[PDB]
């Protein structure tokens, strides 16, 4: 066996899929959009019998800038690793992250992160991975708390609206709203947020996968909204091949902090909703959610679909 | 707004699917055999605004013997509870919880469950109702640990026989086994699960559903195997609507104490999933396991799917 770097995406898709496919379905569009358009130093080893690849690790360092935040080089990823199961429990698992690690520690890496990452696969350690999380353990990473991926079919509900105070107008984004989109933003959430917005539409939303709240002219908050039309493979619509035909998606979403508690972040999920169902979307998602938001989304019939678990190690001094 | 008894299972069917359905899809063929089936007094309490169904609660006492097992009349269930979501936070959950318990607790209950009860329909509060949690703790239930649910496609992997040391025989059981299977399992396991193979040959379940192992010919243990010919709607095979065509299950499996930890429980899983492979099945479940059994399945690629926690609550005296 025999530790190297491969660039071999069907192959990788291929043993993804045989290994997690169930519940982690890929393909090589979203692999290839993910990998590909990552700005950060990233690389993929894999372990190999001969021409076999028999597992691989996707791992990262933070050395692109984050909206206005600045890049922290003490800080690396593990995108993903996967053993085939005809090769577990040989130590290969353990050699990969091995060499993994010791890279992004010659590099000035001190915390490693499972998951979450510029486009991630996994926020954290994947519930249907549970069983690695004493993998993760037994190499020094810490188990820390969960966030949800939550599901709700949009077509099945109908809400009444929250009670409209004057002046808060909730419409699509168009392109004469982007300097304003991006003002608040750097008010507001200027870190990953800001980026995304900047690196999404270089790769592919547009302006219909916007929806905008303004008092008076000023934008307030926002959300973005997936349909299987979007260009753009977003988190919430991943694992789209488990959500059926007229699948869609939401988050994130955001309201100004002087404006929260209001009653506007409701105005402006139920708006965003009520646009996916006029889209004739049936089942969605809202990716990444904390424990605490959940009933917010709840109140919608959002459940609560996947869970993932944030793990860091500490690298020893 | 009236709670009242209901016996109208497509009202109910029909609350169950839109409020949970994307996650726990119902259909009236297992409402029906699971509610009319069981065997412990039962009632199903309805919450309604005049004509409209506008939620329930299903509850059970313990009433029924349990193979060996005398039934404790201190224990009651709820087996399941929805409010339906245009009339959340209302007290409506709150009231048909109420009149279920005071209920059980007049006819003797002390101790009651969240599902775990014969006929179930969750082993537990499922992580998609994790929400409801907090409902729970509200009234003095106490929250403990968690089962799962795993999925695996049987058709994706192929894995090599189990060193088979000679005399131990793995086959389909047929009628003549009756016996023989009914005496190990007042040995090994005369709960829950002997009660189990009684009332399951009574509703539907055939010889080809039963996979046994024989050391000479002693049986020593067995498995119970679904697929889209079963009779019976066994819980691997509850959420069959999420598994596709030719779906399946296996669930549950057991040595004699005295043959374990030699491989055999391997053997056993191993030619129980060539049979089902060989019937073609793809995605199946194993269902309502614990944490520290499920790398024993994991060797075989399954992954958890669904989480449930147990919670109980003690009757103040
Ligand atoms: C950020 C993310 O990518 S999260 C997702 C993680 N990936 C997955 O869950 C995909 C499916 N699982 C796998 O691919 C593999 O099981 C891996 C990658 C987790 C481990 O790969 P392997 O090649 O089996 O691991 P390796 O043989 O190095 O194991 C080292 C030790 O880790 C621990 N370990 C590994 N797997 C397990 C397990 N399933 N349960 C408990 N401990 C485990 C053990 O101590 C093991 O030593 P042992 O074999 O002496 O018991
Ligand atoms: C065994 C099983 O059946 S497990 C599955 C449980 N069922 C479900 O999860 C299905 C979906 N959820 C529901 O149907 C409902 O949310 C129920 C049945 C859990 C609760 O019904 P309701 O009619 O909303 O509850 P009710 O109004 O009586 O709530 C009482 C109190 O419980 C607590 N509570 C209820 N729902 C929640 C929640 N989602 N989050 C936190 N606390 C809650 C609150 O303290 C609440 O008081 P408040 O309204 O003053 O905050």
């Given at each position: ?9 069907s ?13 982690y ?40 800038k ?10 690396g ?6 053993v ?21 520690i010659?590099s ?6 499972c998951?979450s990452?510029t ?5 954290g350690?994947?519930?249907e991975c ?23 079919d ?7 609206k929250?009670?409209?105070k004057?002046?808060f ?20 959430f ?7 917005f ?15 709240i303004?008092?008076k002219?000023?934008?307030?908050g ?5 349909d299987?039309?979007s ?5 919430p ?5 488990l959500?059926?035909h ?5 988050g ?12 506007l ?16 979307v ?17 109140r ?6 996947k869970?993932?678990?944030?793990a ?5 001094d």
């Amino acid at each position: 066996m025999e530790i190297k770097e491969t660039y071999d995406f069907s192959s990788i898709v291929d043993l993804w899929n045989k290994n997690i496919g169930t519940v982690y379905p890929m393909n090589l569009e979203l692999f290839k959009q993910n990998y590909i358009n990552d700005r950060q130093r990233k690389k993929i080893m894999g372990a190999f019998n001969g021409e076999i690849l028999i597992g691989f690790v996707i791992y990262k360092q933070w050395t692109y800038k984050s909206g206005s935040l600045k890049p922290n080089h003490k800080i690396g990823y593990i995108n993903s690793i996967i053993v085939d199961i005809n090769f577990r429990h040989q130590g290969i698992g353990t050699k990969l992250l091995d060499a993994a690690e010791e890279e992004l520690i010659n590099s000035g890496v001190k915390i490693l992160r499972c998951g979450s990452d510029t486009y991630h696969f996994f926020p954290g350690i994947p519930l249907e991975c549970l069983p690695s999380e004493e993998f993760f353990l037994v190499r020094g990473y810490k188990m820390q708390d969960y966030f949800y991926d939550l599901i709700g079919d949009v077509s099945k509900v109908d809400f009444k609206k929250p009670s409209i105070k004057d002046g808060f107008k909730v419409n699509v984004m168009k392109p004469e709203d982007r300097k304003g989109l991006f003002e608040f933003l750097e008010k507001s959430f200027s870190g990953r947020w800001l980026e995304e917005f900047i690196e999404f539409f270089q790769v592919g939303m547009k302006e219909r996968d916007i929806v905008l709240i303004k008092y008076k002219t000023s934008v307030i908050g926002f959300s973005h909204i997936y349909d299987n039309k979007s260009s753009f493979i977003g988190p919430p619509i991943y694992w789209k091949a488990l959500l059926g035909h007229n699948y869609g998606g939401l988050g994130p979403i955001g309201i100004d902090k002087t404006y929260r508690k209001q009653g506007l972040g409701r105005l402006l999920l139920y708006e965003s909703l009520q646009i996916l169902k006029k889209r004739e979307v049936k089942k969605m998602v809202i990716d990444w959610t904390e424990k605490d938001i959940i009933n917010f989304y709840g109140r919608f019939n959002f459940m609560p679909w996947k869970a993932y678990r944030k793990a860091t190690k500490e690298v020893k001094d």
